[PDB]
Structure 1
Amino acid sequence: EILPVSMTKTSVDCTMYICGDSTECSNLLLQYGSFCTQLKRALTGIAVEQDKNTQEVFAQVKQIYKTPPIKYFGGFNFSQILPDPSKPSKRSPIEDLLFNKVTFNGLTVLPPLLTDEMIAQYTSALLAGTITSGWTFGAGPALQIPFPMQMAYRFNGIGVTQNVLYENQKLIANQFNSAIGKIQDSLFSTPSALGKLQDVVNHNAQALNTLVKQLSSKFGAISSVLNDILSRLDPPEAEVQIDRLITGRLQSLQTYVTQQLIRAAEIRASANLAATKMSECVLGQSKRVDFCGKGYHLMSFPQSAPHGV
């Protein structure tokens, strides 16, 4: 299951966008009120909400847990999801495959507060707590327990006694290993798997390209360049043309900001859903039908991804 968690943070400056390096245009913008300050406020609110979403989704553990020297887990391999200490950035192979499949005038893109490695460390700590302690570390101190006993507890939560797991351990382990192996091939072979994550980036890029493209529009004026209009004719007609251009660019900015607000609200809803799914499927076993997967639920493991989980 794949879910977006956040989007890129942007900041826009009014003067460098509209009245580019013109002292005759800055004065004519003061008479239009306080649009710029409230636009900046809205953008800053979106920016801080972006980091709040990630912190809410991922930062759910007080302490960072680390797996012991990897040993026999009853037959389960887990090598494709645990971090590999043999390459930079300390990722997992599936994470590496995920990362390798995802590819101005007055605008600015701000970096996220949390780097990718911190997200990887959160994911590793969550996985270690899940596989060494079980569901107990989500409600207090973590308690150690062997993995087969943990799954014996898991079967007991769906109406199946403990006999089945203990008398069929090897077969279940082999089935789990085969499923894990086939997951990587299924993800790699299918090209249109990470679609929704790419859609967010494509939408943001299209919005930015449209915003920078309309800067060349004449908007029913003499031209689309301030210098030529200024040094060609009388002050009054220059004022009229500058007012026309200012109105057009303000309309464009308003449209962009409203679109960004709507998309941010949608992503906020998605992030809340993702946080709930994490807390209810990873830190415990859920009885809700078709919530943590198709069929009776056993476990769940998270993996980091660009702008999503």
Structure 2
Amino acid sequence: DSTECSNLLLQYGSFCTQLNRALTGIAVEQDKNTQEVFAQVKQIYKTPPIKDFGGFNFSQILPDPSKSKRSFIEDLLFNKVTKFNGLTVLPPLLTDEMIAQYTSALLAGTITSGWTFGAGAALQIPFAMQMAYRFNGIGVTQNVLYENQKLIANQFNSAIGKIQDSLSSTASALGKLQDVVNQNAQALNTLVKQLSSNFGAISSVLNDILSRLDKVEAEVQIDRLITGRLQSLQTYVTQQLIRAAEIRASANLAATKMSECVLGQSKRVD
């Protein structure tokens, strides 16, 4: 916030605004990613009170209202996963609470109505009658579900159990998201630590130069600091843009997986 520095930042014109504009483009892209992954239907669906799902037991993936009303499994996810100056976090438009609502709505449609809520609004169907279609979508005949119904429910309910055990025992898969948190933390703390880099100036701290030098001298060093910090900021923003393109590919891929693999059944093998 130093005026004496800001007087010299003005030598370099648009860059500060351009970086903020790039970061704004990124920030809009984050809400957009989130919106276009999760908000793929323009309704909340309420879960039914009766859990008459032909023996299938979503109780761990569905909300419990006593909890934010996350699922059981989502608590593992929030638990296993893990700086304040110039740098700012901004909240999502879709809070973790609203995302829990939206994932519950998605899941409520995905339980109660199959793919149909991706095309229209949800048209309900019994869950074992949905799964007999999902069998049909892997060339397995609908009767093969019912001829094993309670056993398949047991395999599923057990697999859900093994998922909880795996997720409770280790963060091994969640490393993929702890990775994004870590990349952000590394980039951000790098970006802070770079405020303490000298770049060939007599100090790294701008206030220290302003305390140490009279302005005819101080300009000569502050030009270095500004150029270095700026080059580092641009570098960082470039990492964040490239990472944002990576995350955008991930978000479009995720949105596609939601569109084809949640709201439908992608025949696209593996």
TM over 0.5: yes
C-alpha deviation, 1:50, in angstroms: 0.8
- Structure 1 vs Structure 2: percent identity of aligned residues? 96
Verify the 8 A CA contact 2:206 2:225 in the aligned structure 1: no
CA RMSD of aligned residues (A): 2.0
Match of 1:242?
222
Name the TM-score, length of structure 1 as normaliser.
0.80
Mapped to 1, the partners of 2:215 and 2:51 lie a distance apart of 81
Identify if the C-alpha distance between structure 1 residues 22 and 280 changes in structure 2 by more than 3 Å, giving closer, same or farther: closer
Deviates more, 1:26-35 or 1:96-105: 26-35
Change (3 A) 1:106 1:153: closer
Say if 1:239 and 1:79 are closer, same or farther in 2 by CA, change over 3 A: closer
Alignment of 1:180-191 (within 5 A): 180-191=160-171
- Higher mean Cα deviation, 41-50 or 140-149? 140-149
Q: What is the deviation of 1:157?
A: 2.9
> Is the 2:53–2:127 contact (alpha carbons within 8 Å) kept by the matching residues of 1?
yes
Shift of residue 226 of structure 1?
A: 4.5
- 1:26 and 1:38 map into 2 onto residues whose CA distance is 16
Secondary structure of 1:176's counterpart equals helix
Shift of 1:152: 2.3
Give the SS at the match of 1:177.
helix
| CA-to-aligned-CA distance 1:5-40 (integer Å, 9 cap, x gap) | xxxxxxxxxxxxxxxx54433322222222112111
> What is the Cα deviation at residue 234 of structure 1?
5.8
Task: State yes or no: 1:56 paired with 2:36.
Answer: yes
Q: Which runs of 5+ in 2 are unaligned?
A: none
Structure 1: runs of 5 or more not aligned: 1-20, 291-309
- Find the counterpart in structure 2 of residue 91 from structure 1: 70
CA distance in 2, matches of 1:149, 1:225: 67
**1:107 corresponding residue in structure 2:** 87
Q: TM-score, normalised by structure 2?
A: 0.91
CA spacing shift, 1:289–1:230, aligned 2, 3 Å: closer
Indicate how the Cα distance of structure 1 residues 240 and 153 shifts in structure 2: closer, same or farther if over 3 A, else same.
closer
Distance 2:207 2:126 in 1: 75
Deviations 1:123-166 (A, max 9, x none): 11111112211222221143222222222223233333333223
Q: May I ask how many residue pairs the two structures share in their alignment?
A: 269
1:225 Cα deviation (Å)? 4.4
- 2:195·2:205 contact (CA, 8 Å) conserved in 1? no
Q: Which has the higher helix share?
A: 2
Q: Cα–Cα, structure 1 residues 153 and 246, in superposed 2: closer, same or farther, change >3 Å?
A: closer
Which deviates more from structure 2 when the two are superposed, residues 204-213 or residues 152-161? 152-161
